[PDB]
Amino acid sequence: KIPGYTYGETENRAPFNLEDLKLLKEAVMFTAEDEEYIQKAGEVLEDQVEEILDTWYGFVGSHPHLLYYFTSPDGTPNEKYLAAVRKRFSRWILDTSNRSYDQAWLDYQYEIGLRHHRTKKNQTDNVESVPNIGYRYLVAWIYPITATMKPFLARKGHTPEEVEKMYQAWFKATTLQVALWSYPYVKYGDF
Amino acid sequence: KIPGYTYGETENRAPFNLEDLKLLKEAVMFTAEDEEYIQKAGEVLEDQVEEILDTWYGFVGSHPHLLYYFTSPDGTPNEKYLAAVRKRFSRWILDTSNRSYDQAWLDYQYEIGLRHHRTKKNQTDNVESVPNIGYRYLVAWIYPITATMKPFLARKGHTPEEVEKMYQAWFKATTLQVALWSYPYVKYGDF
Numbered sequence: 001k002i003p004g005y006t007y008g009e010t011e012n013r014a015p016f017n018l019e020d021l022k023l024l025k026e027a028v029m030f031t032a033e034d035e036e037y038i039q040k041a042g043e044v045l046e047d048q049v050e051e052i053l054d055t056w057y058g059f060v061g062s063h064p065h066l067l068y069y070f071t072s073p074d075g076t077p078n079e080k081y082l083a084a085v086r087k088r089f090s091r092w093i094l095d096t097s098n099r100s101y102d103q104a105w106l107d108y109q110y111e112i113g114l115r116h117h118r119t120k121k122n123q124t125d126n127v128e129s130v131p132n133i134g135y136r137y138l139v140a141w142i143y144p145i146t147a148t149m150k151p152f153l154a155r156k157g158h159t160p161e162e163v164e165k166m167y168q169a170w171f172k173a174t175t176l177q178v179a180l181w182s183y184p185y186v187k188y189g190d191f
Numbered sequence: 192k193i194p195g196y197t198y199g200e201t202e203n204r205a206p207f208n209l210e211d212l213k214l215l216k217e218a219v220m221f222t223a224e225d226e227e228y229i230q231k232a233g234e235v236l237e238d239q240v241e242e243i244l245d246t247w248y249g250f251v252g253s254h255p256h257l258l259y260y261f262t263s264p265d266g267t268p269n270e271k272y273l274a275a276v277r278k279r280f281s282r283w284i285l286d287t288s289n290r291s292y293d294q295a296w297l298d299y300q301y302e303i304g305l306r307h308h309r310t311k312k313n314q315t316d317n318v319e320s321v322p323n324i325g326y327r328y329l330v331a332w333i334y335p336i337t338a339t340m341k342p343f344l345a346r347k348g349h350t351p352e353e354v355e356k357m358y359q360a361w362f363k364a365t366t367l368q369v370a371l372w373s374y375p376y377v378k379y380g381d382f
């Protein structure tokens with residue numbers, strides 16, 4: 001059990017459906033081939049999820065304007081917030097790799113969007129923190145979340161081009177999701 | 192002259208400044224090393240800019256829901272629109288490589304955002320087309336605009352490690368810009 005992790009039990013239907021997903025997957029050049037390799041990436045990443053998260057949390061920790069989004073109103077880091085989110089963030093690596101991308105998947109993407117946005121931020125862990133994460137930074141994180149992953153994908157001794165195929169799947173999957181999470185941020189009708 | 196290309200003469204000020212850019216550059220892990228390598232990418236790409244646009248326009252052309260954003264009301268591609276945008280799109284490759292990322296640069300990023308958004312779309316070329324490019328697809332394009340560039344960066348005979356450095360600079364620069372272009376799409380206060 002992971003506190004706050006409500007995959008498959010959301011209680012809002014995403015405003016996007018499988019037809020939206022098909023066309024967005026096309027925009028990001030994700031095909032049947034990538035499903036194979038994202039799943040392959042999951043087998044490779046399963047044991048390293050703690051290292052990856054340390055890398056990501058280290059990036060957060062070293063940037064005051066990034067750590068800021070986890071802070072209590074007095075500017076100090078909320079330790080409980082960081083730790084609770086970490087378990088769901090870590091699980092997300094595996095969900096990205098293992099889940100079928102169906103309507104339950106989409107409904108969670110919407111939920112994750114809401115949690116970054118002022119709509120639901122700080123509700124999941126019942127914490128008091130900054131109200132909203134500026135959208136500029138979710139798009140910006142496509143880079144670190146994609147690029148810092150690559151080394152971990154090579155850690156099971158796979159062939160240069162196999163690593164490359166897992167990386168590309170990961171790059172597309174990260175981009176695809178961030179695009180979906182923009183929904184609560186974007187003016188109604190502009191998404 | 193490039194019709195509709197108003198870099199340095201937008202006479203609207205960006206709602207983001209150099210301090211915002213510093214913090215966004217940090218989010219995207221863009222440093223002085225990347226300024227060197229983005230500049231080097233420009234030298235490599237200068238000669239290849241038409242074949243690059245052929246590739247991107249080839250992607251647009253094979254997906255009806257993408258070609259869509261360049262269509263006249265009858266659903267056929269507006270040829271005047273594609274051709275005029277192609278010149279500004281091709282110049283943007285070199286601007287990304289060659290310009291100082293200063294307030295003049297930021298002001299144009301804001302203009303480019305306005306041009307994909309319903310605020311200014313179709314005004315520059317005085318064309319009749321669809322009102323808005325769904326923001327979901329700008330984020331999504333981070334993938335093809337980044338990944339399809341990579342082979343072009345290798346055509347000047349550079350080593351794979353130098354190509355890798357130009358490619359990483361290009362990936363960060365693309366992500367960085369798309370993040371900025373979200374401004375007119377994001378609910379005020381949520382960017």
Ligand code: HEM
Nearest residue numbers: 066069070085088089092115121122124137138141142145
């Ligand atoms: C590629 C971009 C990003 C990815 C892949 C990502 C991933 C995630 C995931 C998987 C969760 C947990 C979702 C759940 O509750 O199940 C989460 C929540 C969270 N993330 Fe992000 N995120 C991104 C952008 C950012 C940025 C830029 C920040 C700023 C530091 C950030 C800070 C946070 C915070 C504070 C939460 C907890 C939100 C809440 O109160 O529920 N994230 N993120």
Ligand code: HEM
Nearest residue numbers: 257260261276279280283306312313315328329332333336
């Ligand atoms: C990484 C994402 C993208 C990049 C780097 C990019 C780049 C550009 C550039 C440089 C221009 C010309 C700007 C100027 O006026 O000087 C432009 C305009 C345009 N682009 Fe994009 N673009 C992206 C996303 C998209 C998407 C997803 C579409 C959908 C097909 C699209 C279609 C168009 C259209 C229709 C225009 C003309 C807008 C107008 O009427 O002024 N772009 N883009």
